[PDB]
Amino acid sequence: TLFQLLREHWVHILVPAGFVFGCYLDRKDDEKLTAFRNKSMLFQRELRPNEEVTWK
Amino acid sequence: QWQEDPEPEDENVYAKNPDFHGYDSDPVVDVWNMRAVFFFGFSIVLVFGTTFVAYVPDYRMQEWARREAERLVKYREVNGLPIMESNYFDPSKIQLPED
Amino acid sequence: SKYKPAPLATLPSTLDPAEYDVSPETRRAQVERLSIRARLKREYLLQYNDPKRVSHIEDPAL
Amino acid sequence: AFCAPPAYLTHQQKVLRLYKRALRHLESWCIHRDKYRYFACLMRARFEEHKNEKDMMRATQLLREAEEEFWQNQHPQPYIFPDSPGGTSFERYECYKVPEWCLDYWHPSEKAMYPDYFSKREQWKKLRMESWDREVKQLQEETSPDGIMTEALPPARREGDLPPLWWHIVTRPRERPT
Amino acid sequence: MLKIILPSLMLLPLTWLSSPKKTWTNVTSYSFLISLTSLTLLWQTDENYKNFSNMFSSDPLSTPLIILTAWLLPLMLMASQNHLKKDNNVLQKLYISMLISLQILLIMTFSATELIMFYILFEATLIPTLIIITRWGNQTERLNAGIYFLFYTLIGSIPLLIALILIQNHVGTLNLMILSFTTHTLDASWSNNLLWLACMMAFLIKMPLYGVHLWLPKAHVEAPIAGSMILAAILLKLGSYGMIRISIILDPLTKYMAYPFILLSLWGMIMTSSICLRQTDLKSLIAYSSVSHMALVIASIMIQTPWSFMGATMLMIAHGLTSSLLFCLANSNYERIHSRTMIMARGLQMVFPLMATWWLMASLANLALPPSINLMGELFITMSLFSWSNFTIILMGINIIITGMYSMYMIITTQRGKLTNHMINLQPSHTRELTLMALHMIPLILLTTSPKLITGLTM
Amino acid sequence: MNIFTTSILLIFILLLSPILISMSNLIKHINFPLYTTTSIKFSFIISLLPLLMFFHNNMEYMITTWHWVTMNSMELKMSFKTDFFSILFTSVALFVTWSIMQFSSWYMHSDPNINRFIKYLTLFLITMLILTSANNMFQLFIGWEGVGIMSFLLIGWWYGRTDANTAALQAILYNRIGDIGFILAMVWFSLNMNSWELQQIMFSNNNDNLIPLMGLLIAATGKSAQFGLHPWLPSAMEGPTPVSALLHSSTMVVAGIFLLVRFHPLTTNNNFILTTMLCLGALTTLFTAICALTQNDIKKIIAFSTSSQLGLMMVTLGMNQPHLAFLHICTHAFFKAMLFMCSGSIIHSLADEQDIRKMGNITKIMPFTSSCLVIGSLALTGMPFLTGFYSKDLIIEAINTCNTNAWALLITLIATSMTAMYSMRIIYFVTMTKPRFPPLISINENDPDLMNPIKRLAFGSIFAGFVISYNIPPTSIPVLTMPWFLKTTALIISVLGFLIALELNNLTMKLSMNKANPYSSFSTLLGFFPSIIHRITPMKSLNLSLKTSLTLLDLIWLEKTIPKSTSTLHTNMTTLTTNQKGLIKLYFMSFLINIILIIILYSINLE
Amino acid sequence: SWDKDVYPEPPSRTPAPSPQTSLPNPITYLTKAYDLVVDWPVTLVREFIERQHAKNRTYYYHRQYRRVPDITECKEGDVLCIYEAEMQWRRDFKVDQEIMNIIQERLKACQQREGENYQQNCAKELEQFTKVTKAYQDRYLDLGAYYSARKCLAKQKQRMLEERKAARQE
Numbered sequence A: 001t002l003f004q005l006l007r008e009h010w011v012h013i014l015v016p017a018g019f020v021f022g023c024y025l026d027r028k029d030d031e032k033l034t035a036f037r038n039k040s041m042l043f044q045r046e047l048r049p050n051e052e053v054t055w056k
Numbered sequence B: 001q002w003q004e005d006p007e008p009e010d011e012n013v014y015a016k017n018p019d020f021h022g023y024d025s026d027p028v029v030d031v032w033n034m035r036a037v038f039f040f041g042f043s044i045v046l047v048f049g050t051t052f053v054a055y056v057p058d059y060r061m062q063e064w065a066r067r068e069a070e071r072l073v074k075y076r077e078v079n080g081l082p083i084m085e086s087n088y089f090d091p092s093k094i095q096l097p098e099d
Numbered sequence C: 001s002k003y004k005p006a007p008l009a010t011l012p013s014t015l016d017p018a019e020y021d022v023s024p025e026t027r028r029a030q031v032e033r034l035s036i037r038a039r040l041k042r043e044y045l046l047q048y049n050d051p052k053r054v055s056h057i058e059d060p061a062l
Numbered sequence D: 001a002f003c004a005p006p007a008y009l010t011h012q013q014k015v016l017r018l019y020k021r022a023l024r025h026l027e028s029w030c031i032h033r034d035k036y037r038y039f040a041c042l043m044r045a046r047f048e049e050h051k052n053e054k055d056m057m058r059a060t061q062l063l064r065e066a067e068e069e070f071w072q073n074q075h076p077q078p079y080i081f082p083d084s085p086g087g088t089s090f091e092r093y094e095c096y097k098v099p100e101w102c103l104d105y106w107h108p109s110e111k112a113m114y115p116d117y118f119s120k121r122e123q124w125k126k127l128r129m130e131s132w133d134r135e136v137k138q139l140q141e142e143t144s145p146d147g148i149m150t151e152a153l154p155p156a157r158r159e160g161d162l163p164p165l166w167w168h169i170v171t172r173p174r175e176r177p178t
Numbered sequence E: 001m002l003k004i005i006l007p008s009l010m011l012l013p014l015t016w017l018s019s020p021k022k023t024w025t026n027v028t029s030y031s032f033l034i035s036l037t038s039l040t041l042l043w044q045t046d047e048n049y050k051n052f053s054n055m056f057s058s059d060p061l062s063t064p065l066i067i068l069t070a071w072l073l074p075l076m077l078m079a080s081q082n083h084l085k086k087d088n089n090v091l092q093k094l095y096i097s098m099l100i101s102l103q104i105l106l107i108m109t110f111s112a113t114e115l116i117m118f119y120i121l122f123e124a125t126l127i128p129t130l131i132i133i134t135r136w137g138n139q140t141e142r143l144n145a146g147i148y149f150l151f152y153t154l155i156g157s158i159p160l161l162i163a164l165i166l167i168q169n170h171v172g173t174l175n176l177m178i179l180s181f182t183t184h185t186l187d188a189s190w191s192n193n194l195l196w197l198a199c200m201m202a203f204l205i206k207m208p209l210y211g212v213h214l215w216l217p218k219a220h221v222e223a224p225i226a227g228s229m230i231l232a233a234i235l236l237k238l239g240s241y242g243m244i245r246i247s248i249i250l251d252p253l254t255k256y257m258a259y260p261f262i263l264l265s266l267w268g269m270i271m272t273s274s275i276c277l278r279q280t281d282l283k284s285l286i287a288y289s290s291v292s293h294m295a296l297v298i299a300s301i302m303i304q305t306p307w308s309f310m311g312a313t314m315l316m317i318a319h320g321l322t323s324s325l326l327f328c329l330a331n332s333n334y335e336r337i338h339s340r341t342m343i344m345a346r347g348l349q350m351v352f353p354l355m356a357t358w359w360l361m362a363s364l365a366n367l368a369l370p371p372s373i374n375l376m377g378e379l380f381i382t383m384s385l386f387s388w389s390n391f392t393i394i395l396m397g398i399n400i401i402i403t404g405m406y407s408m409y410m411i412i413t414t415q416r417g418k419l420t421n422h423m424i425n426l427q428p429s430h431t432r433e434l435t436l437m438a439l440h441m442i443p444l445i446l447l448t449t450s451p452k453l454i455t456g457l458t459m
Numbered sequence F: 001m002n003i004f005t006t007s008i009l010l011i012f013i014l015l016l017s018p019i020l021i022s023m024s025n026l027i028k029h030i031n032f033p034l035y036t037t038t039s040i041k042f043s044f045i046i047s048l049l050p051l052l053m054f055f056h057n058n059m060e061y062m063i064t065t066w067h068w069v070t071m072n073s074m075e076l077k078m079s080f081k082t083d084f085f086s087i088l089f090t091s092v093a094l095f096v097t098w099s100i101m102q103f104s105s106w107y108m109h110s111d112p113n114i115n116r117f118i119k120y121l122t123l124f125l126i127t128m129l130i131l132t133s134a135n136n137m138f139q140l141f142i143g144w145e146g147v148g149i150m151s152f153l154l155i156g157w158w159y160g161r162t163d164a165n166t167a168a169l170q171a172i173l174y175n176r177i178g179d180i181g182f183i184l185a186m187v188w189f190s191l192n193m194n195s196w197e198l199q200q201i202m203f204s205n206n207n208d209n210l211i212p213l214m215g216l217l218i219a220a221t222g223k224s225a226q227f228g229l230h231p232w233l234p235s236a237m238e239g240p241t242p243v244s245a246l247l248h249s250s251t252m253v254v255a256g257i258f259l260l261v262r263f264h265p266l267t268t269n270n271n272f273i274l275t276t277m278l279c280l281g282a283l284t285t286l287f288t289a290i291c292a293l294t295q296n297d298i299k300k301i302i303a304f305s306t307s308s309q310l311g312l313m314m315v316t317l318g319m320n321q322p323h324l325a326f327l328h329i330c331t332h333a334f335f336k337a338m339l340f341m342c343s344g345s346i347i348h349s350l351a352d353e354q355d356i357r358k359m360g361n362i363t364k365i366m367p368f369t370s371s372c373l374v375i376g377s378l379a380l381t382g383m384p385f386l387t388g389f390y391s392k393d394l395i396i397e398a399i400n401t402c403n404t405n406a407w408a409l410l411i412t413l414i415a416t417s418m419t420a421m422y423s424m425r426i427i428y429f430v431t432m433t434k435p436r437f438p439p440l441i442s443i444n445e446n447d448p449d450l451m452n453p454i455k456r457l458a459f460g461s462i463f464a465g466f467v468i469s470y471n472i473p474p475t476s477i478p479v480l481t482m483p484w485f486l487k488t489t490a491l492i493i494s495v496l497g498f499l500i501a502l503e504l505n506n507l508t509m510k511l512s513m514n515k516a517n518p519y520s521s522f523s524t525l526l527g528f529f530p531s532i533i534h535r536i537t538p539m540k541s542l543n544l545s546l547k548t549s550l551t552l553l554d555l556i557w558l559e560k561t562i563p564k565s566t567s568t569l570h571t572n573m574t575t576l577t578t579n580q581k582g583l584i585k586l587y588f589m590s591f592l593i594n595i596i597l598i599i600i601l602y603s604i605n606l607e
Numbered sequence G: 001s002w003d004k005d006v007y008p009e010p011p012s013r014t015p016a017p018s019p020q021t022s023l024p025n026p027i028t029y030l031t032k033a034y035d036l037v038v039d040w041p042v043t044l045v046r047e048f049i050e051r052q053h054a055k056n057r058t059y060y061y062h063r064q065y066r067r068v069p070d071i072t073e074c075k076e077g078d079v080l081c082i083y084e085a086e087m088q089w090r091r092d093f094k095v096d097q098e099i100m101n102i103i104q105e106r107l108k109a110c111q112q113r114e115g116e117n118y119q120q121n122c123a124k125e126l127e128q129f130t131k132v133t134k135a136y137q138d139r140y141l142d143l144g145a146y147y148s149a150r151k152c153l154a155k156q157k158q159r160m161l162e163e164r165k166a167a168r169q170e
């Protein structure tokens, strides 16, 4: 658009990109902790017709 | 004496910019700092944050617990059972020491 | 009759024997005290009325 | 309130102050005007009988005994004028006595509502700024050699000079400000 | 928590890569948006607490403390701008980075699931705190204030470190959830009594407990305003939060081990509140007021009742907003006449009518006017202590009387009476300053509307 | 129950709208004092409907409008007890407040902050109705503390006056000492009944309620200015006259009596509490009647009149007559508000003069104000068939004909004749006698904003007692059988008090100088209770705060024993170990000692 | 509406009325004016709202929790089993709190309803509040801020052992 404009307003992607990246890392934390998905006493059930996992 | 600056004099912030908002000596920077604080602090956080909190459902399962209590009070009364018993655990599930 | 002073109900000046003393030793003290007060008052007022003062008046006693 | 007190009260000053207090507390006891007038005249006769006491040492002793008598016959709840120290309206309007230097912070939109008042105020500020240096010099010139000093201030001796330290007296808030 | 912590970390490059004229507008705005995101932690539709990973969690105790932490960062930035406006650009950015660092460290501290992680973050906060006090404090006594603050903390923290290692060597973990479920009764040995004290002293010094509180009046009088805000609002709450987490493993020794600390707090709260009647320094007065309030928090945590924990949680949040407000109000007069002597500026209601309104509400909050959360916390603490021993009400009653006396004393002295009219440099209130006061007081009122959010773990 | 409930809720809504408008920019485009008077006026009219439906069917309500927060097994709900006490107090308070607010427009016309003054009075009224309609103690405590803060702000209205700010803090202090008792009751009921709701607290009837009832009594003692916590009420006359008419005579000062009326089911089964109330009330009704006999400020005489009538309410509560004590709140509100209005009418016309010694001849120069002043004084003194008669006469009957402490009985009757005496003091020195005011006479009592509000309360002071007495349901069974001298005791001692005072006042005109006997000085200086307690107590407590708490401990001994001794030790250890000569000969000698020590330890520890 | 079984209300018994005087009753006329000016327009607005609601009818369900093994059946140190049992106990404890609230609500409603007769006509609600309070105290009193299924069980066993001792001595 303009190097004077962009050199001033490009920093507005840092915190939003921290949020999106922080959300991405939190979903990766969910993936490492699926050892009891659909296996607890309280919640385990039979899978619905076209259902691969109870939560993702 | 040593070589040291004199203390600076008191300044009236409104003398140069009588529309000073407290944020900056540059007038345009000043008004936009004022707007960002009012917009993000009040229009966004305080209004939408208040709204979001207000519509958190069944906070700490308080609505479910009252709903569950009425179901049990109803059940325990038609069938003549006590509303609440002294023993949380059925005594048959407990093995006391012989002594 | 008679008024007995207490720490929380002090002696009036009119009943104070030291208010009716006119000895030149006392009158010299009283004049000396007023000279201190008057000089301090003058210093304060010169600061107070000065049209170039931009800030409050510093108060060394406080 | 306008005149500073002296280093000490002369014997005459102390007697006249007791006279004013004595009458005022008599008025509080009597209430009714005819009764007060009767006893006010009896009170003056007691101050007159010793008016020409030339002993001094006896005069001072007569002042002692009267003051002791006043304290015993004092009215517990004397009448106080409403605006006087201890009166009901004393300092009632202090919350409305805004100093003049507050106007220096008024916004231009605030000042534009009194275009004529703020033109006159500029003249008073210009007058104040020009007179200050002369005022300071006069007080420096008129200092006595011996250290004995009082709170009384001198007048303006020359022409076009204003009396020293006048701004805080002349421009003070009104008694009834609003 | 990573979706809260990562954007907070991005404030550091944002500060350093912004233009000098955009730094404050940038960092303040995104700091507000990060406060908005922390409200996601309040979406709690069940009674299972949020465990995001092995490392970070959030439950009804940490969630309010995390959100209050996130809210303070924008408020501290606005508070700092005016007195930093003479510093060069790099010094301003360095200051902002110190403020962001505390925000990051504190959010991680309140969400840590493991006690040595809590300890490391708990100790890390001293570095930015000390830097703020000593580099930007105004007086020569700021260096002594730094020493007291650092070493009152550290001497208590070393025994805490020993106790944490000892527990881990014995149990095999310092994870909080597992310590909760597998806890077993302690024997009442001398060795276990020393263990109790090692686990408690650092948190008690941090509150601070009466007797070891001298660091706090020193630290407040000398710190800059943003340092006072974070110290009174959040840093003292690390001790109370630490005590609540770790006391789960200390039973049943707290039944007798708590007596000296209940006594110091209940008597001490009268000594420190009575000091406020004769304090010439306004900042010191507010600081001693905090010590009196945190004495109540100590007592209610020590007796370990459902009411006592709930009253302590509310008071922690309410005091956090109220005391931070009072420091900001005091700093607005100081920035005009550059003195903290309370009796110097007077009759200020004459010239700052709206700021005087903020003063009155802060004072009414401080003396616990119902139905404020300030009163709600103090009330439930009083009920739990009365149950613990009916004679506690005597000391409670005295403190309530004294608290009203000094709270109204501060208002009468500074806002009322005749205006000290030699102060011609009393410039009108800044929009920023009036906004700062509102950002404290609206949440206090909103939390009074919905007090379920700050009840803590027991209710 | 929809029309009834809607009316109760609509009264609060109407009273909030002036507060809401204050926050908008609309307040400066309307006549705000006129708008606020109309809102209160309509709110009184709406309040008459629930009053009528109660007079008909006598049905009582518990209304819950909002669930605030549940603390496990304790639910806190905004709820309202709309019963006899609440319905009738609402109608009386709104009527009186309607007069005060209209009067304030004329009285405070010159005040540049009239809008804030009107707003503060409205807030006080809202907090007072929260206080009298609350169904639970926490909601009650909101109103209890609310009126305390509003009275503080209104007493210290002229905030540049040091004496006003001192009187404002004095009211806070005494009422905070009372609030300790309120909190004591609250903590006790939440632990022993698990509730602050009045319905659940009623099942405490059989318990021993000494601890909580002693707490309520202490709270009432402060709030109703009973002996011990009494001095703040006369000091509250620092505020503008409309403040004194509303708060410190008609509404705020009866909250203590009202609290003890609400908990009358528990106090009835506790003779110790009933005995204490009886004797506390009797001491207050006498002590403040003595004080009033020699006061010269017109507002102080009426203030002490209030404390003396509150003492009589406390005596009635001590006789187990809660409904009579409540009926005196309602009747007292009419003629006392009028008395303050009429004195404010006089004070305003005589250029802010409050001393009765500079008044006189008001009966001729201010005919309307004087006529209402006499009407109000006759209602206060128990003139038959005026509003005061329909409650005060029954109170005097009840005390004569009941098992009661005999000193309490006597001084209650002595204080009743003394009521006639200080009423005569105002009538003699203000309305009769000759002029004593400054010669420039600019009296004007023709404003409708002055005459109409007083005229509305003059009617209440004539007919309100009769109308209320015949509409309320029967309550306590009165004793109507007694000797003629017990039936006419109230009338006889009142009339006797007039003759004694009328005689003693005429003796003030004889040309004989008055002296200061020790009994009058006691009366004038208020038994010296302020001149001692307000000097010794703050002095001792403020001295300890500085000398002991701050100086001896925090600045000296807590410094000396912890941080300063630690610093000294390590500095001392530092200088003893670092003061080395730098001589290799000395170090090598010390290394020889190290070697020998290590060899000795090895030898002794050799198995 | 609500369940008349959970929140029982006695049937109303309102008299005739049988007016004697010839004066008109102002409450009667004010109610008729109220029912026209106020009640009638409010009902139309509500009926419009209810008509909109039926066009967008959605539903919600009360969640059901299957029972899991109690703390009594958990091996000590078995955190997976302790966790589920402890979470079950917290759910039950919460529901017990609301049962206490229902019983107190009945008690308060009955006292108000009975008025001067409350000391006689509230006997059943006062007895149920007394029984249900005894049972509550036995489960939960003195557990402390860290209350849990393990502490509740230890409290029960301590009481059972004392009851057994007293019975054995008999």
Ligand SMILES: CCCCCCCCCCCCO[C@@H]1O[C@H](CO)[C@@H](O[C@H]2O[C@H](CO)[C@@H](O)[C@H](O)[C@H]2O)[C@H](O)[C@H]1O
Residues within 6 Å of the ligand: B048, B051, B052, G055, G056, G057, G058
């Ligand atoms: C913090 C800020 C929060 C911002 C809040 C914004 C929330 C917006 C609310 C949108 C609500 C409407 O949401 C919409 O409602 C319809 C009702 O037709 C529901 O839709 C569902 O039920 C309807 C019932 O008729 C069916 O027809 C439809 O096929 C089905 O999907 C869903 O719930 C959603 O599709």
Ligand SMILES: CCCCCCCCCCCCO[C@@H]1O[C@H](CO)[C@@H](O[C@H]2O[C@H](CO)[C@@H](O)[C@H](O)[C@H]2O)[C@H](O)[C@H]1O
Residues within 6 Å of the ligand: E144, E147, E148, E151, E152, E155, E156, E205, E212, F562, F563, F564, F566, F567
């Ligand atoms: C049990 C838990 C609590 C344990 C906490 C222990 C805290 C120990 C803190 C040690 C403080 C070190 O403090 C260090 O020494 C003293 C403290 O008096 C200060 O000394 C200061 O006061 C002395 C007089 O006493 C002055 O002469 C000196 O000029 C001044 O600096 C030093 O400036 C500071 O550097």
Ligand SMILES: CCCCCCCCCCCCO[C@@H]1O[C@H](CO)[C@@H](O[C@H]2O[C@H](CO)[C@@H](O)[C@H](O)[C@H]2O)[C@H](O)[C@H]1O
Residues within 6 Å of the ligand: E151, E155, F566, F567, F568, F570, F571
């Ligand atoms: C187990 C360790 C726990 C304690 C932690 C360590 C705390 C530090 C204590 C030792 C150091 C403080 O030392 C203490 O303060 C300062 C030095 O700073 C000295 O005080 C000195 O400061 C400066 C520098 O010399 C002089 O100008 C001053 O006049 C003098 O008083 C004190 O006389 C000493 O007692």
